Amino acid sequence: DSLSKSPENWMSKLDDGKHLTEINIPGSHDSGSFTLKDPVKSVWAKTQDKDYLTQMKSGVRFFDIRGRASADNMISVHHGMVYLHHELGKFLDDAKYYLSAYPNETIVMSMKKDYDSDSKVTKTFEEIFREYYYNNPQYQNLFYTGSNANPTLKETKGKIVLFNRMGGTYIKSGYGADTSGIQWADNATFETKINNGSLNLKVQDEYKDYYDKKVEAVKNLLAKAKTDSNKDNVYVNFLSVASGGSAFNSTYNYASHINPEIAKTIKANGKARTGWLIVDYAGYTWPGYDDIVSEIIDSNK
Ligand SMILES: O[C@H]1[C@@H](O)[C@@H](O)[C@@H](O)[C@@H](O)[C@@H]1O
């Protein structure tokens, strides 16, 4: 019986000793944009329709969280200048609940500054996150705090793994958790060594692409992962694409076709390594076409 049919805890069904790197993970791009209702804002700033807990119930384990310091102790979730109507607390509290109810899953959480801090803010984004969230008492036991750069599933069971997109940081656990952070190339397919050289991150993040290009970039990186047995390589590619104006053109209209297209490829490829794939409108189904989150889930042994 395929893993898809039980996406509330497919990771529990996996060999503990695999590095998260090795596991093919479903991710949601701009994970918290589900709260947006505005029809015009939604064509470009909205990337999901399911809330956090539902995303998790549907099997997504990589959450792309973008934030803005609103106060010296609070980080607002954002798609750029657009406030997505909740603080980071909403996500972490949602992660805590789920992780207890399904103690054999792990969540990787990407953290990024997406917009400038309020005028009344004293501290840096990194300081506010590190000191009021990463090691806030209320979430002790929640984050990974080990010292392994390439954590095993067993090591992270029941925890959030920091994926550090904040620049340099004093947090000492997670991917890119050092004073260098991650070297992110704008609108590109790139490689960069992270965690002191102990990991080679590989990203397809060509978000300005048009349809043909995007699908090609997704599939090019996808094919490289198919071959790569290396536990020290990380693969993250976003199927997601920046919309246009108009709505036509909208984020959903892209995801509505990119997701199924990449979904058919993956299933055809049998069980094989895919890397971490980050999608818009995860959990969104269109009858007749394959589900990208399901085929990602099903490609793990
Ligand atoms: O442009 C932004 C940002 O620069 C991210 O790195 C990219 O991955 C997103 O997809 C988004 O649209």
Write the layout of secondary structure elements.
Elements: E1 26-28, H1 39-45, H2 52-57, E2 62-71, E3 74-79, E4 82-87, H3 88-101, E5 107-113, H4 125-134, H5 153-156, E6 160-165, E7 188-194, E8 199-205, H6 211-227, E9 233-238, H7 251-268, E10 276-279, H8 292-299
Parallel strand pairs: 1-2, 1-10, 2-5, 5-6, 8-9, 9-10
Antiparallel strand pairs: 2-3, 3-4, 7-8
Helix pairs in contact: 6-7, 7-8
The structure holds 1,2,3,4,5,6-hexahydroxy-cyclohexane (INS).
1,2,3,4,5,6-hexahydroxy-cyclohexane binds next to loops.
Q: Under CATH, the topology is which?
A: TIM Barrel
Number of strands: 10
Major sheet size, sense and barrel closure: 10 strands, mixed
Q: What is the number of helical segments per DSSP (H or I, 4+ residues)?
A: 8
The total domain count is 1
How are helices and strands ordered from N to C? EHHEEEHEHHEEEHEHEH
Proportion in β-strands: 15-25%
Ions, cofactors and other bound molecules: 1,2,3,4,5,6-hexahydroxy-cyclohexane
- Based on the coordinates given, report the CATH architecture: Alpha-Beta Barrel
Which structural category do the helix and sheet elements fall into?
alpha/beta
What's the shape? Answer: globular
Q: Look at the structure and give the CATH class.
A: Alpha Beta
Helix content: 25-40%
CATH superfamily: Phosphatidylinositol (PI) phosphodiesterase
Radius of gyration: 18 Å
Query: Termini distance?
Result: 12 Å
EC number: 4.6.1.13
Protein name: 1-phosphatidylinositol phosphodiesterase
Keywords: Lipid degradation, Lipid metabolism, Lyase, Secreted, Signal, Virulence
GO biological process, one term: lipid catabolic process
